[PDB]
């Protein structure tokens, strides 16, 4: 059961809308994005007994 | 005498859930609960395969299968003791294999223990073991005890004062299982899959410190057999079906509209080959061989909860 | 450390993390005769990060 | 003596299985006898199998 | 006699074992500047491995 999310739009809509706080003018910047999968790899089904 | 069991469980989806479901960041139509019910269908399928494997693991583990109202996945509380009548389910070890007294001296001898099990099951030609299926690090218990070290040192000639200085423990465990297999003949299988229980700590399927023993051959110990459930009136009369079923129900016209999926099955494992002259059943046995095996194992990562 | 160069003056990274749910559970047990009971609930989680 | 061992300079301690695999052979070879093993049994009236 | 403190081969072997399930951490290579054999030749546990 995954969260019903679109990762591209959610990953694009975190970037700040206006947010001039630092230098009192908008700076130049570069942004790279990456997602990550998280699972428990060590929860494996008990494949032994169906063989028997 | 033999008699099956029954299993069933349900879902539901109300009107607010079917009508309102959008994606979390995209802006789309009402079409997400269609994709959402398919995961519940697949989850009920895997949820039934887990009870097949659970019943069969329970009969291999304890011989009997025991259901009781304290169980997690039992709301009904149906108490059951289905005693399959395994004669001697466990093998006695008063002092375990990794039990040392004094200064490095061990207590018992594993290779000799399986040797006189084979010898004292001579004229019972069905109690005489063939294979072992042990999961965790088992070579270390063969590598630290006294007698199997003395057998490796007998075989490789490595007397400590004259041939070589002292071999490391790693050189012991890289051949201890092989000399064990050669001096007994029990083909040892390994099965090291794991399940994450509610502690958050990884445990193997074969528990550490225990090994199973098959008693006549490696093969099917009986079978798991389903029985028939109800499917309704193909022509005018009731015609059954046999496997695990899964039923969907539309109530999207009713007040309020809802939607429910129901799956379940009927079945129970059966032990086919019994003894004839006596009514015994010596086909698989357990034994707990050591106590401190987790210290021989690498640690496991925590579950990321983010 | 190799050399690369950019015409811009800031670099930020956005990391997103996703923990889908695991299909645990076991089918409930009833006697032939009885109506069914519903299963429990579970949760998946999504987090983010900046640089 | 017959195999070429010593408990201090060739092997550590040979196991009992090698002793019983070689003992009947060296018994036949030293004594010059002929061993006719005979294993057939009969039930007693007490249920106990007796040779 | 010269029985040292830490067996370095067992030390790095324990660092490789205790990062079996942490594959980002399990070390692979190692850079050392000065005379490094001048310490391994003066270590009793390493000398026993050589013997």
Numbering used by the authors:
A (entry chain C): 1 to 52
B (entry chain C): 104 to 409
C (entry chain B): 53 to 103
D (entry chain D): 257 to 307
E (entry chain B): 206 to 256
Give verbatim lines from the article.
Single-particle reconstructions imposing icosahedral symmetry were calculated at 4.4-Å resolution for the procapsid and 3.7-Å resolution for the expanded capsid. In the case of the expanded capsid, there were interpretable regions for side chains for most amino acids, enabling atomic models to be built for both the major capsid protein gp89 and the auxiliary protein gp88. The model of the major capsid protein revealed the canonical HK97-like fold, with major insertions that result in a supersized capsid geometry with an increased lattice constant. The extended N arm reaches toward an adjacent capsomer, forming a “crook” in the expanded capsid, and contributing one strand to a four-stranded β-sheet. Moving upward through the capsid wall, two further antiparallel strands of the β-sheet are contributed by the E loop that overlays the P domain. The outermost strand of the sheet is contributed by the N-terminal region of the auxiliary protein. This interaction is observed only in the expanded capsid, as the auxiliary proteins are only present in the expanded capsid, at the local and icosahedral threefold axes. Only in the expanded state do the E loops become stretched, adopting a well-defined β-strand conformation and creating the binding site for the N-terminal strand of the auxiliary protein. The auxiliary protein trimers, present in the expanded capsid, further stabilize this state.
A key step in the assembly pathway of double-stranded DNA viruses, including bacteriophage and evolutionarily related herpesviruses, is the packaging of viral genomic DNA into the procapsid. During this process, the large terminase protein docks onto the portal protein, which is embedded in the capsid wall, and translocates DNA using free energy liberated from ATP hydrolysis. Cryo-EM reconstructions reveal modifications to a canonical capsid protein fold, resulting in capsids that are abnormally large for this virus class. Structural information on the portal protein, through which the genome is packaged, demonstrates that the capsid influences the portal’s conformation.
